[PDB]
Design a protein around this ligand. Structure first.
Ligand SMILES: Nc1ncnc2c1ncn2[C@@H]1O[C@H](COP(=O)(O)OP(=O)(O)NP(=O)(O)O)[C@@H](O)[C@H]1O
Ligand SMILES: Nc1ncnc2c1ncn2[C@@H]1O[C@H](COP(=O)(O)OP(=O)(O)NP(=O)(O)O)[C@@H](O)[C@H]1O
Lengths: 308, 268, 325
C-alpha cells in the first residue's frame, strides 16, 4: 500500500494541534480508496513545533500493534505537512458522544473500547513509552468494530541515556486541552515525577467521560488543578475498575496488563468486531462516499528588484 | 495574578531581587519569576543595564544546560523555567558541604556542556559558581545568572576581555592584578576549577583583602585536573578540550547515597 | 541459558536466515529463534521490573565482540522481524554506551570494523530498515571517533541526497543526523569545514535552492548557526566574502515565505556586520544601499518583537554608515 506526494480532499472530519491541523476525509485518486489526510501549515509553526511534529512521525513508525492506528504515508506538499492514515468510519468516541450518545455510552460498548485502549497501552508501556493523551477524542472505532488508540503526538519515551528511567519529569508541550485527563503527578511537576501509571489515571478519566458523556472537571484550568491535587465517578465491577484507575497513589494503580484481568472485562464475550457495531446500534457508519452526504453540514459521524 | 501567571512562595533572594514560584494559569506549567524592584535596581550600579543585557542574551540562547527565559512583564518580572534547587543550596544542606565524586562528576560534565555551548556563542559568563548553577527536577543542570556576562563580537579574533565584576572568590589571578586584556574563556575555566574544587572538597582554594591572595597562586588531595584548571598562567591552563580528554573527566566513577536535594500553590 | 548461549544461538539462527534458499519449516524456527534471543539480550542489557545485571552485561558484551554478531545484525537487519529490528537497535544503543575505566569498548570495536557505520548510513535507502539504521547511526555519532570516520568519508556526501527524500519521516531523520554530525563535536566540525570547504558548500549551496520548503527553511537556519559558532570563525569569513552568497541571502529576503526570509535576514546580518568586507561584497551593498535602507525599514513590520526591531535598527545604521576605504 504505497502512496505518492493526487488526493481529493473532502470533508473536515476533525481539527487539532492548537488549530493548526485540519483533519480531512480524502480520496486517494490512483486506487480510489478513502483515507484520512492530516494537514498542518508549517508556515504557522515555530522551528520547535516542526521538530515536535517530526517526533510524532518517528514514534508512529516505531509502533506496530492491532489497537494502534497506523500511519500510511508522510510528506511535504507545499508548506504543509501531510500524514495519511486509514479512515475510521465511526469517528472517535468523542464524536459518538457529542454526536449521539450525549448522556454517555452503553456499558458493554465501554468495556470493548476500554479493552482496546488497555491492550495498546500495555504495548506502548512495554515499548518504554508513556502515552500522555489518553482521552475519548483519541479513540477511533473502525468501519467494522476495531478500536484504535491515537494521539501519538504526546508520546514521551522513558528510555534515556540508552537506559530505562524509573520516572520522568517532563511537562508535556501543547497540552492545554489534555489537562483534565492528566494524572495529579504529571501536573504537580515535583521531584517524584511520573511513569506509565499516569495513563491509567487517564483511562479512569476516559472511563467517566464515556460513561457520563461530559469530561470530568469545562471549568478553568486552575480550578481543576486544585481539585485533582478529589476524583470523578452501572455494574459494581465498573465502579471498582474506575476506583482503581483513579487512585491517588500511582504505585497502587494497577498496570495495563493486570487491568486487562479486571472483572469488568468478564462481560466481554464476542470480539469487538462481532459485537461493537451492534452496540453502537442506533448509529450506522458511512459506506457510500459517492454522494453529497459528505458535503452535508452535519458531517459524516453520528449518522442514524535588487540590482546585481 | 500577573498576566496569566499566579504567584507562590519565596524560593530565594540573591543580590538583585526576590525570586518567587509562579504557576502558568492557562497551561498549568510550573515556572519561576525573578521580581525586581525598579527603584532598587537604579541604585545598584549598572543594575538596570545588567538586567536588559541578560534578557538580551537569554533571548538568543538555547541549550539543555543554559537557564531558559520564558517571558518578560511590566508595570518588573522575569519569568524563568522552574528549578527545584541551586547547587550551593545542596552543599549548604549537608555538614560535609561537598558532593560524593559520582554526583559531582555528573554536575561537572553538565557544566562543561553549558560552558562549551556559551563560549561557542561567544558568551564569557564571568560568574561561574554553585549559586549560579540550578537543577531541574530531572537533575538537568542549568547555568543561570548571565548578569555580568560579556558577549564577544562575532568578528573579534580573540576572546580578549577588560572587566571583572564576577564573584570575588571565583576570580583568577589575571583579575586579582588588573592586567587590562585577558582571555575571557580562561577566566570561565579558573571559575569552573574553583567550583569543582569546592563541590568535591567542601572548601575554597583561596580565603580573604581577597584579591592579593589569588594573585600569588594549595591542593588538599582529579588532583592533576585541578592543577590544570587552576593554573596561574592562562597559557598553561587547560582548554575545554583538555578537560574533556583528561582521565578524571572520561572515567565513569562507580555510583553510595548522594545529596538528595533539601526538603506552593494550593492556598491561591 | 547464558549470554554465550544466547549469542551462539543468535549467530547460528541468523546464519540459517542468510543461507541462500532453504525449507520453509526452518525459516519459521529461525525467525522465532532470532526474535526470542534478541528479547533476552535486550532484557539482559535493560533489565525488567531486576535492574541490569552488572556481570551478565560484561559477559554479553565480550561475546558480542567475539561472535562478529554485531556486524552481522547490522548487515542482515532486513532478515529480522519487525519487533526484532527495534530490539537490534536497542541492544546496539546500549552496548555502545558501555564504559570501563576511561575506555569505551564498543567504540573501539567499531573502529576496527568501520563498515558497520557505512552499512548503517546506507540504511536510509531501504525504507523497511531506515529508521533503525538512523537510530543506531545517531547513537554512534555521539562518539567523537565514529563521527570523524563518517565526516571524513566519501559517503558523507550522500546525506545531501538523503535529506531531499520525499518521505518526510526518513528525510527528517537523515537531516537530524546531518545537523548532529556538523554541530556536536565542535572542534571536529570546524576541522571538517575548513578542509572540505569547497565541496561541502557546493553541495550546501544546492540545499538553499531546494523546492522542498522544509529543506530550504532548515538548511538556512542551520547555515546561520554554523556561521555564528566561534569555532567556525575562519569558515564564516570565507562564506561572507563571496558575492554569490550575498546575492543569495539578499534574494531570500524577498521570498514567498515569511519564515525563509527571516532566516536569510539572520545570515545576511553577518555579511553586513563584517568590518573587513572584500570589494565586490562591499560593492553590492553600495549599489543597493538606498534600496536596502528602504527594504530593512519596512521589513516584516508585523511582529513588535523588540530584539528583532533592535536588529533591523542596528543593520540600517550599519548600511547607512557604509563608505569606501
Ligand atoms: N483516521 C480517522 N478516522 C476518522 N476520524 C478521525 C481519524 N483521525 C482523526 N479523526 C477525527 O479527527 C479528530 C482530531 O484528530 P486528533 O488526531 O485527535 O488530532 P488532535 O491534534 O489530537 N486534536 P485535540 O484533541 O484538540 O488535540 C479526532 O478526534 C477524530 O474526531
Ligand atoms: N529559575 C529558577 N527557579 C527556581 N529557583 C530559582 C531560579 N532562579 C533562582 N532561584 C533561586 O533564587 C535564588 C536567588 O536567585 P539569583 O540568581 O541570585 O537571582 P537575583 O538576580 O538575586 N534576583 C537562587 O539561589 C535560587 O535558589
Amino acid at each position: 500500500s504505497s502512496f505518492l506526494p493526487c488526493y481529493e480532499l473532502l470533508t473536515v472530519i476533525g481539527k487539532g494541534f492548537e488549530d493548526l491541523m485540519t483533519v480531512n476525509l480524502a480520496r486517494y485518486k490512483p486506487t480510489g480508496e478513502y483515507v484520512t489526510v492530516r494537514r498542518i501549515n508549517l508556515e504557522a509553526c515555530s522551528n520547535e513545533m516542526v521538530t515536535f511534529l517530526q517526533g510524532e512521525l518517528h514514534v508512529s513508525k516505531l509502533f506496530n500493534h492491532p489497537n494502534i492506528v497506523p500511519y500510511r504515508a508522510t510528506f511535504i506538499a507545499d508548506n504543509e505537512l501531510w500524514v495519511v492514515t486509514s479512515f475510521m468510519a465511526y469517528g472517535s468516541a468523542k464524536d459518538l458522544i457529542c454526536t449521539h450518545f450525549m448522556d454517555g455510552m452503553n456499558e458493554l460498548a465501554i468495556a470493548y473500547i476500554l479493552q482496546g485502549v488497555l491492550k495498546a497501552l500495555d504495548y506502548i508501556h512495554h515499548m518504554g513509552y508513556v502515552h500522555r493523551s489518553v482521552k475519548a477524542s483519541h479513540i477511533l472505532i473502525s468501519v467494522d468494530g476495531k478500536v484504535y488508540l491515537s494521539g501519538l503526538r504526546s508520546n514521551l519515551s522513558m528510555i534515556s541515556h540508552g537506559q530505562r528511567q524509573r520516572v520522568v519529569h517532563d511537562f508535556p508541550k501543547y497540552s492545554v486541552k489534555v489537562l483534565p485527563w492528566l494524572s495529579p503527578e504529571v501536573l504537580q511537576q515535583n521531584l517524584q515525577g511520573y511513569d506509565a501509571k499516569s495513563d491509567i489515571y487517564s483511562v479512569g478519566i476516559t472511563a467517566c467521560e464515556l460513561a457520563n458523556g461530559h469530561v470530568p472537571f469545562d471549568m478553568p484550568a486552575t480550578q481543576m488543578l486544585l481539585e485533582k491535587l478529589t476524583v470523578p465517578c452501572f455494574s459494581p465491577h465498573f465502579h471498582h475498575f474506575v476506583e482503581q484507575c483513579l487512585q491517588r497513589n500511582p504505585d497502587a494503580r494497577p498496570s495495563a496488563s493486570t487491568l486487562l484481568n479486571h472483572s469488568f472485562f468478564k462481560q466481554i464475550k464476542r470480539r469487538a468486531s462481532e459485537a461493537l457495531p451492534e452496540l453502537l446500534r442506533p448509529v450506522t457508519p458511512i459506506t457510500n462516499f459517492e454522494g453529497s452526504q459528505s458535503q452535508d453540514h452535519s458531517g459524516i459521524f453520528g449518522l442514524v528588484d535588487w540590482e546585481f | 495574578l500577573i498576566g496569566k501567571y499566579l504567584m507562590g512562595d519565596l524560593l530565594g533572594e540573591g543580590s538583585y531581587g526576590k525570586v518567587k514560584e509562579v504557576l502558568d494559569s492557562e497551561t498549568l506549567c510550573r515556572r519561576a519569576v525573578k521580581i525586581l524592584k525598579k527603584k532598587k535596581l537604579r541604585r545598584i550600579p549598572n543594575g538596570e543595564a545588567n538586567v536588559k543585557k541578560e534578557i538580551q542574551l537569554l533571548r538568543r540562547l538555547r541549550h539543555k544546560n543554559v537557564i531558559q527565559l520564558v517571558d518578560v512583564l511590566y508595570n518588573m518580572y522575569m519569568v524563568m523555567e522552574y528549578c527545584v534547587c541551586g547547587m550551593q543550596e545542596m552543599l549548604d544542606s549537608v555538614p560535609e558541604k561537598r558532593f560524593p565524586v559520582c554526583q559531582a562528576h555528573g554536575y561537572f560534565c553538565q557544566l562543561i556542556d553549558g560552558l562549551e555551548y556559551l563560549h561557542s556563542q561567544g558568551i564569557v559568563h564571568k560568574d561561574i559558581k554553585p549559586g549560579n548553577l540550578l537543577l531541574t527536577t530531572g537533575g538537568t543542570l542549568k547555568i543561570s545568572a548571565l548578569g555580568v556576562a560579556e558577549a564577544l563580537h562575532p568578528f573579534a579574533a580573540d576572546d580578549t576581555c577588560r572587566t571583572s565584576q564576577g564573584s570575588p572568590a571565583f576570580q583568577p589571578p589575571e583579575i586579582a592584578n588588573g592586567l587590562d586584556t585577558f582571555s575571557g574563556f580562561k577566566v570561565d575555566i579558573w571559575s569552573a576549577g574553583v567550583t569543582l574544587y569546592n563541590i568535591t572538597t567542601g572548601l575554597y582554594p583561596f580565603e580573604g583583602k581577597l584579591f592579593e591572595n589569588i594573585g600569588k597562586g594549595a591542593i588538599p588531595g582529579l588532583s592533576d585536573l585541578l592543577k590544570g584548571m587552576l593554573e596561574y598562567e592562562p597559557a598553561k591552563r587547560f582548554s575545554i578540550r583538555q578537560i574533556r580528554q583528561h582521565s578524571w573527566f572520561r572515567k565513569k566513577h562507580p555510583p553510595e547515597a548522594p545529596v538528595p536535594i533539601p526538603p506552593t500553590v494550593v492556598p491561591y | 541459558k547464558s549470554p554465550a548461549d544466547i549469542v551462539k544461538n543468535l549467530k547460528e539462527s541468523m546464519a540459517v536466515l542468510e543461507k541462500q534458499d532453504i525449507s520453509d519449516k526452518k525459516a519459521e524456527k529461525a525467525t522465532e529463534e532470532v526474535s526470542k534471543n534478541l528479547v533476552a539480550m535486550k532484557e539482559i542489557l535493560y533489565g525488567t521490573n531486576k535492574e541490569p545485571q552488572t556481570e551478565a552485561v560484561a559477559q554479553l558484551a565480550q561475546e558480542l565482540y567475539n561472535s562478529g554478531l554485531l556486524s552481522t545484525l547490522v548487515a542482515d537487519l532486513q532478515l529480522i522481524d519487525f519487533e526484532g529490528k527495534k530490539d537490534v537497535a536497542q541492544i546496539f544503543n546500549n552496548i555502545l554506551r558501555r564504559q570501563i575505566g576511561t575506555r569505551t569498548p564498543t567504540v573501539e570495536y567499531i573502529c576496527t570494523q568501520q563498515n558497520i557505520l557505512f552499512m548503517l548510513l546506507k540504511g536510509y535507502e531501504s525504507p523497511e530498515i531506515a529508521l533503525n539504521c538512523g537510530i543506531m547511526l545517531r547513537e554512534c555519532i555521539r562518539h567523537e571517533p565514529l563521527a570523524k570516520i563518517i565526516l571524513w568519508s566519501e559517503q558523507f556526501y550522500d546525506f545531501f541526497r538523503y535529506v531531499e527524500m520525499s518521505t518526510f519521516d526518513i528525510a527528517s531523520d537523515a537531516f537530524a543526523t546531518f545537523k548532529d554530525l556538523l554541530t556536536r563535536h565542535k572542534l571536529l566540525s570546524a576541522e571538517f569545514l575548513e578542509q572540505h570547504y569547497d565541496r561541502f558548500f557546493s553541495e550546501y549551496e544546492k540545499l538553499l535552492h531546494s523546492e522542498n520548503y522544509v529543506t530550504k527553511r532548515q538548511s538556512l537556519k542551520l547555515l546561520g548557526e554554523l556561521l555564528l559558532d566561534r569555532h567556525n570563525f575562519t569558515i564564516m569569513t570565507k562564506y561572507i566574502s563571496k558575492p554569490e552568497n550575498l546575492k543569495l541571502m539578499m534574494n531570500l529576503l524577498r521570498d514567498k515565505s515569511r519564515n525563509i526570509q527571516f532566516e536569510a535576514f539572520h545570515v545576511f546580518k553577518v555579511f553586513v556586520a563584517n568590518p573587513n568586507k572584500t570589494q565586490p561584497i562591499l560593492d553590492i551593498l553600495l549599489k543597493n544601499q538606498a534600496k536596502l535602507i528602504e527594504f530593512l525599514s519596512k521589513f516584516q513590520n508585523d511582529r513588535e518583537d523588540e530584539q528583532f526591531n533592535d536588529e533591523k535598527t542596528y543593520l540600517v545604521k550599519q548600511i547607512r554608515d557604509l563608505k569606501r576605504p
